[PDB]
Nucleic acid binder design. Structure first.
Lengths: 97, 78, 103, 95, 97, 87, 105, 93
DNA sequence: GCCTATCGATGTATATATCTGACACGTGCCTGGAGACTAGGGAGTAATCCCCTTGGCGGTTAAAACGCGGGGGACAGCGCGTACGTGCGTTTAAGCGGTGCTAGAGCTGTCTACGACCAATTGAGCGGCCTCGGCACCGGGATTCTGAT
DNA sequence: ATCAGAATCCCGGTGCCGAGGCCGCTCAATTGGTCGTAGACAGCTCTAGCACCGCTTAAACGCACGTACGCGCTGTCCCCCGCGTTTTAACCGCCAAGGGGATTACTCCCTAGTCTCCAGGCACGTGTCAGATATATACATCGATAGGC
């Protein structure tokens, strides 16, 4: 048997809004943090809690931006979120010039 | 390694945001937005660290930088 | 102790010292730390009461960051107070738009 | 090693007041401590700015009252103000 | 006879008002509204000639920015008319309630 | 007629052409008809917030007159700093 | 050249800046070099904004910088608009901007 | 009463950058507010930075790092340069 | 079905002319800055201890990645009809000049309680160390959603 | 409306380590005393904020008509979604350097604090020049008209 397009999506929304974990993988985010940091000062050590806090903040910010993006998508009578939706959401917040 | 933020990870982030259906061009935009966010939040953590004669970026520096941009983080040292 | 004299559990003396070492003002009055400690205790009691109610509704007997997030986001005034705060390991309030649900 | 301070015991006493049998985890302990610190600094910076505004140099209870009224929301700034006034009154009553 | 069309005069109005610093709300009604909004919080209150002007300047700055966001939300939904849904969205994404 | 006048509610005193003028300074070409009573509410709420903060400032200083500095301080408390009108 | 601003080579005051730092409760011991640095920074920013506003005044055939010119200078430049973006300039107006969708064809 | 302002200093800066251009009283009232706001922002950042490191002093360095944190990239890089110039040739004499 | 000549309809921008109101500049004064000097503690230095991040290895699992079909949604096109724009004449009230009053801002001077500092004392509070119960888990059944009959 | 059947709920056993006590100890809060600036309090001045009327005059209001934008419907398509399969590296567990954060004590210079002295800095009063404001020009924007092509 098969599930129709959308129902398992609703199941995932109900699943991931119920948990409190960190969705992005730890090691790739750690590497991203260090490669970004190297551009400012070379060979910086990081406390594990520093990268953990950075990850938590990044996920919170991205989830809030996705909420605004979903609101923008629903405004245009669409269920698909598109890059223009993210652009509009970041702009209105003043995050984008 | 900005590509390390995988497509399923961004999809999970969208599901926790209430999104039901995602365009195929969302992933690159999300990666770019995350990169700008991290650059903004790390350029200040590294400055808070440089002023302190430290080579280790502590959680306090990250918390201070995040608080400076109007994003107060509770539970990681403050 | 001023905490017992003021009838509080929060520390009046440490609040005075922190008001003193923070460069907030050259001089600090006698009643300022008592009032500040009372307000802080009231706010802490409010958050803890709502969080414990949420934990009881979840059958958890120990408050965890998720319960704090639920209590804060469920109360309008506390949400306004903690509106630009990101409680770590808190998650998001369950909410799905009506359009997304099937007809 | 160092000597650190936190608002961990007083919060744990308030918890016994509100819910006698409930507990709190370490992460929640740190989160509540950070909340208390943040509110303290907000209500202290507002009071300092208010004192500066009126060419004032003393932070007294009136500045704290008005800062709690500016910062806190509508209904949360009423019970808090009443509690602070009660605490100040009963502190000045006793020696 | 000479009859301009829907939207022709509007553009000239946009160009005229975007080139001007004049305060586009009339001062006396706004002053009265300010006093009665202030009278719920405290009675027996007086206002200086400059406090009301500062309030009005801030108010129209806020409203102009909000209308920019409202027009951009309208264009997002493939519309040229700005509707109340647009204002509600443009104030939701910015966190105001 | 020579008896009295309507005594209009003055949130209506922010007339339709005034709101339209504000929209046109915002770059709006075409405007709906239900967006006036909503703009009035938005403006009213903004004014309540700002005026409540400035009246708290005024009361703390033990004054009966709302100074321009009180309004500027109330606006700056909300991330709406106003240049040119004091401070 | 007895003034500290003379030794610092700045037009903005250094004694006034030092007094404001001391009496502002910023810290309990203001260093001797902080006022000079802060005065230089403020002078730099003021000169930047004024030079950008005078150009707008010249382009508009005006010999006096009014708030309109300051608004144009601040909002046109990316860095100043970033520093002063969420700040209101009284009687400054808005930047002329009409969007492609609305213009006629 | 006795009131202080930055007007004369802004006017001297104007004569340097644009010797032939004047300024209105409202533009000057805006520029003075700008100077005050930037002063408070930089000074508050410096004070908080002193507090973080358990220090008790605002040195020229703390002002430098507050400038780096607050001002945008290019403006920060030029402002630090000119402030360093001012401090070094002040301490020279 | 053009889109290209062309009208006379209004709008904008640019030209010179004469005022005023507000902008430069000067004058006198005084309050704040500059130049002495002091004592003292805050910051810089060197030196030591030890946590703590870094890199390495291996295993095992989950997760990520790639491929496929197909169906549900985005998008273009079309038609309909009500709402919004534009112009007219008429009416309302904002704007600016008066009028008059007086509450309230803003200053000085007084003086006395509150607070700033110091010293001696003690117990709250923090960490060391310990333990016991609760929660994450794991797997087994029932359960409730569902997916085409 | 109906079944089977994936996928969360529900339940009991297990069990690991973190939350909750109990103690030793120190350094931070408390008590007591003294001294000095600072702030509530009285008093007086006069600035400017309050209401109103009078009068002009442009904005606001009400109404009509016409056009075009919004909204619903339909149809085509492609691009996402959900499942299976194979691949990849994240996670974890452990051990091990050693670099760097945190302490310690010592020491010298920078900064507060005081006093004296005067020159930079604005209030006040002023003359005149940029700019408000014109109405004149001269020239564009824009249906509407109707001509071939």
């Amino acid at each position: 048997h098969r599930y129709r397009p959308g129902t398992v999506a609703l199941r995932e929304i109900r699943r991931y809004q119920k948990s409190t974990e960190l969705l992005i993988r730890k090691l790739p985010f750690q590497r991203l943090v260090r490669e970004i940091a190297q551009d400012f000062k070379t060979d910086l050590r990081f406390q594990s809690s520093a990268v953990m806090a950075l990850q938590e903040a990044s996920e919170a910010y991205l989830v809030a931006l996705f909420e605004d993006t979903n609101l923008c998508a629903i405004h245009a009578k669409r269920v698909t979120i598109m890059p223009k939706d993210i652009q509009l959401a970041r702009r209105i917040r003043g995050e984008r010039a | 390694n900005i590509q390390g933020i995988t497509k399923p990870a961004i999809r999970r982030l969208a599901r926790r945001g209430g999104v039901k259906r995602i365009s195929g061009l969302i992933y690159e935009e999300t990666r770019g937005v995350l990169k700008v966010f991290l650059e903004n939040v790390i350029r200040d953590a590294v400055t808070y660290t440089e002023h302190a004669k430290r080579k280790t970026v502590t959680a306090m520096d990250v918390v201070y930088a995040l608080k400076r941009q109007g994003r107060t983080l509770y539970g990681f040292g403050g | 102790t001023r905490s017992s004299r003021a009838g509080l559990q929060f520390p009046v003396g440490r609040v005075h010292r922190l008001l003193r070492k923070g460069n907030y003002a050259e001089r600090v009055g006698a009643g300022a730390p008592v009032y500040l400690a009372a307000v802080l205790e009231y706010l802490t009691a409010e958050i803890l009461e709502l969080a414990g109610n949420a934990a009881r509704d979840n059958k958890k007997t120990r408050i965890i960051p998720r319960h704090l997030q639920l209590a804060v986001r469920n109360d309008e005034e506390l949400n306004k107070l903690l509106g630009r705060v990101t409680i770590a390991q808190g998650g998001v309030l369950p909410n799905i738009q009506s359009v997304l649900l099937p007809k | 090693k160092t000597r650190k301070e936190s608002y961990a015991i007083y919060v744990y006493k308030v918890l016994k007041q509100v819910h006698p049998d409930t507990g709190i985890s370490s992460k929640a302990m740190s989160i509540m401590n950070s909340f208390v610190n943040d509110v303290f600094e907000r209500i202290a910076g507002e009071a300092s700015r208010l004192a500066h505004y009126n060419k004032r140099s003393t932070i007294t209870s009136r500045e704290i009252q008005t800062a709690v009224r500016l910062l806190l929301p509508g209904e949360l700034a009423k019970h808090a103000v009443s509690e602070g006034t009660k605490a100040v009154t009963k502190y000045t009553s006793a020696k």
